[PDB]
DNA sequence: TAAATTTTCTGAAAATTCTGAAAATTATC
DNA sequence: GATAATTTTCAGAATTTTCAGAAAATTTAG
């Protein structure tokens, strides 16, 4: 019982202290207290984290790990489990152990634990071990981590959607204020500007498309105001441009 | 089994976390909803306070003093002494007796609950002390598994507090940054024109004649239009042309008039 | 047994010609198709949505529960039974009477002990559009009956998908039209439309435009120009009654929405 | 043989989901539907319209190379064969080589003496929408094969009917818009519209509206208001270029037609 | 026919988008 | 610093735009 409390404290410090799929590292944390390999999948099937703590046989695993994508079939199979399942044998297709070697670990047992945020399935955790099976304390720890990770996923996803919605509203609000010639100039300049940042000469392109140089300057200022870009004058070397809002080039090409 | 009951209790709290997040609600005692569940699952009285003492949730399921204690619940503020006493403990301290000053039971009525037991758990949402949970029970003691469950509840509540504060901080800072970024793109004459225009408007919205102000401050009429357009781009204002009646303006960003006068 | 199957599939194909011509005021569109399917299968047939809203039915056999007749009248199946059948991914046939997915009343479970039931789900794109329920006294469903059942299931599924896609696209096009209209009104014109249709307080009627214009401090001609810009986009239908005022009729239903927004 | 038939019908039902869209700007949209049908029946399959336009095909087996390839490339079957199959009215199967309705080339008839072919007509709302043609060497079509063939036939028939209904409805909406808009312009506004779009001499461009207004003795406000009435109905897209005039773009293609009328 | 409205057409003050010269800016040598 | 090549600020005008305002034109009841 004391060790259980210690493990819960270990995980509390660990997890609490764009992350580029952090959960992989987080999986290691979950493994340590349970001394087992861990896998984490989303509701769509996209792999979001894994840790091969024990002596695995690489192969498709090495790749599914490298490619950051689990086999579509197994991931779409676990999504319907609804509630927790424990001590699943090796002969079952729901096993975490690679089937390439089922004779190597017949004693292995595996577990599936679903993740739920605000009442919707956010993902699933998978654990696997040998010799002794998962008892209740291990399930307590598993669901502890499940709920914590559920809330972290919900937080990151809500923040990301809010960010993209604000950025898209900004882009639309800005483009709806540009004039005809200003919009043509924006198209021309950002078509010449290969990439999100660089340097170019605005007056030359302005002469190439038949628009007065001041109109282009004013357009770039209307964009700077709404934070879509950040312009800086290089004098005789031209103007330097950097795109801050990422939803801009898409709505422009559209 | 002790472990079986523990697992069942953790599941009972998980199911409420799923549907009762109530993330839209930011009303007085947001977590009190969270407090009720914890009081029931432990079959004990529960209180939730901030590091300063502001009450955020409570449940007097069992027999309480009420006469002198109800004043704290109604005013939603615990006594400064007890809160500053719980602030001294770094880590969890459980099965505290009544003779200790850390007791959750009333000092008015101490002989009514001679065997009463109480537990105190500090809260650290972001590795920083945000508050503390207080539990109180009669005779039945706290074993190890219940401590696991208590710290479970502490950790869950931490992130809800973290979000409640983070959203507003980011929102207000975003509002101020928008105005700063917009004003930093106007030229000297354009900025002077904005100052003149919004001092002449004297309101959150209204109507005026831009050409008149332009002639009054010695700036070309087109510069005012262009400046208001630079503001429209950033969603700071909403301008509408009324032709012979002038221009209509509406201030969307509330941090704008403030950043101008300063 | 196979020739009769082909004949029945052809008999269902033949009726699609006349059934495609539909009237929304019938309140029971697929009912015709339900009768057809009941007839070739000599069985009770029901068609429900994913939520339980009834879309078609036929009482070949006796239900002996005035409680079920009401279900037909109210055009709503019990939410519990619908939520039980909604979980079925694929077709299930020859369902006994003891099962809760049975179409028979719980009053009469021993009254029709041999009764069998079949459930066929309807799908389109990646979502469930509804469900078909078949029920029989003693006689069982064989494989050929299931072939015919799924034939009808697919036909009705795609007809439902088309009707709903048509409705959705129509209303979204109408809403884009309204937005395009308000984006051309001026400040005073937009305020004027608000005033007039708030004073109209209905879907159609008659009023005096000059009075309202004077009441809100706007020139009378501005009202005319705004309402004409609305008529141009087919959003309304205005006609001048001279000294009796103007008559207005709202054609586009998505208009009041863009105003209230 | 009934279970096997049910299995085949279930796999094709599973395939109906995949399409999951209706823009379908493809050269031979039903070609996908043809491929599936070709595989399950292990026979060559062709899908043509009532006029002969090819809509989908799969040449699994040997067919003439030179002249028959032009039918696939040009996407048009010979007028004689199409008008011969349009007369069939009902399904006919196991058609020998001596019949003119044969799917095999008449150049190479001595290569495939036993080849058989089947024709299935497509019907929407009592109208022939097209025809499916199937061809096998030696092996014949049984009753279950016809059940499956007509199963696919009805699906493709309703898909054709839906796409065609959408095309007609779109053009009718476009035609109604121009008349509904022009019926709201006044005399002077109509004169201005005529003058401006005769001056534009094209589908899009730039001009000076005030100049034209003075040139025909009409107030500039009339032109602005008329172009606003047109913008409201999405007939055009105007944008102000200030000192450079007004920019115009014609969205509705039936507009210039109704003006020249 | 006459009141009682609704449309049409004219006028004018203002707003707006664009050209183009004078002034500030950065950079190279 | 000196000079070239840009960027930016600033003044201006042709045009567009919106609204106000009096005829005309239009129904309805008479
Ligand atoms: C279709 C339903 C009315 C049947 C169900 N067994 C009931 O009696 O409620
Ligand atoms: C092309 C075939 C489908 C028709 C006909 N048998 C011919 O050879 O032209
Ligand atoms: Mn006049």
Automatic annotation (TrEMBL), chain B:
Q: Where is the Global transcriptional regulator CodY N-terminal domain?
A: 5-185
Annotated Global transcriptional regulator CodY C-terminal domain ranges read 204-261
Q: What CDD domains does the record tag this protein with?
A: HTH_ARSR
Any one GO MF annotation of this record? DNA binding
Segments forming a coiled coil? none
Could you list this entry's UniProt keywords, alphabetically sorted. Cytoplasm, DNA-binding, Repressor, Transcription, Transcription regulation
Q: Name one GO biological process term.
A: negative regulation of DNA-templated transcription
Database matches in Gene3D superfamilies:
3.30.450.40, Winged helix-like DNA-binding domain superfamily/Winged helix DNA-binding domain
Any single Gene Ontology cellular-component annotation: cytoplasm
Q: Which InterPro entries match?
A: ArsR-like_HTH, CodY, GAF-like_dom_sf, GTP_trans_reg_CodY_C, Transc_reg_CodY_N, WH-like_DNA-bd_sf, WH_DNA-bd_sf
Q: Which residues bind DNA?
A: 210-229
Q: Where in the cell is it found?
A: Cytoplasm
Keyword Transcription regulation listed? The answer is yes
> What Pfam families does the annotation carry?
CodY (PF06018), HTH_CodY (PF08222)
GAF domain: annotated span:
3-162
Family label: Belongs to the CodY family.
Summarizing the function annotation, the protein's role is: DNA-binding global transcriptional regulator which is involved in the adaptive response to starvation and acts by directly or indirectly controlling the expression of numerous genes in response to nutrient availability. During rapid exponential growth, CodY is highly active and represses genes whose products allow adaptation to nutrient depletion.
What's the protein here called?
Answer: Global transcriptional regulator CodY
Which gene produces this protein? codY
Automatic annotation (TrEMBL), chains C, D:
Domain named Global transcriptional regulator CodY N-terminal: which ranges?
4-184
What's a single GO CC term here? cytoplasm
The keyword RNA-binding is assigned to this record? no
Q: Which residues bind DNA?
A: 209-228
- Compartment(s) of residence: Cytoplasm
Question: Which GO terms label this protein's molecular function in UniProt?
Answer: DNA binding; DNA-binding transcription factor activity; GTP binding
Instruction: Tell me where in this chain the Global transcriptional regulator CodY C-terminal domain is found.
Output: 203-260
What top-level branch of life does the organism fall under? Answer: Bacteria
Main location class: cytoplasm
Q: Which CDD domains match?
A: HTH_ARSR
What InterPro entries is this protein classified in? Answer: ArsR-like_HTH, CodY, GAF-like_dom_sf, GTP_trans_reg_CodY_C, Transc_reg_CodY_N, WH-like_DNA-bd_sf, WH_DNA-bd_sf
Keyword Zinc-finger appears in the UniProt entry: no
Name the keywords, alphabetized.
Cytoplasm, DNA-binding, Repressor, Transcription, Transcription regulation
Cross-referenced Pfam families: CodY, HTH_CodY
SUPFAM superfamilies per the UniProt record, alphabetical: Winged helix' DNA-binding domain
GO BP terms: namely:
negative regulation of DNA-templated transcription
Q: Please state which protein family the record places this protein in.
A: Belongs to the CodY family.
Q: What does this protein do?
A: DNA-binding global transcriptional regulator which is involved in the adaptive response to starvation and acts by directly or indirectly controlling the expression of numerous genes in response to nutrient availability. During rapid exponential growth, CodY is highly active and represses genes whose products allow adaptation to nutrient depletion.
* Record protein name field: Global transcriptional regulator CodY
Write the lineage as a comma-separated list.
Bacteria, Bacillati, Bacillota, Bacilli, Lactobacillales
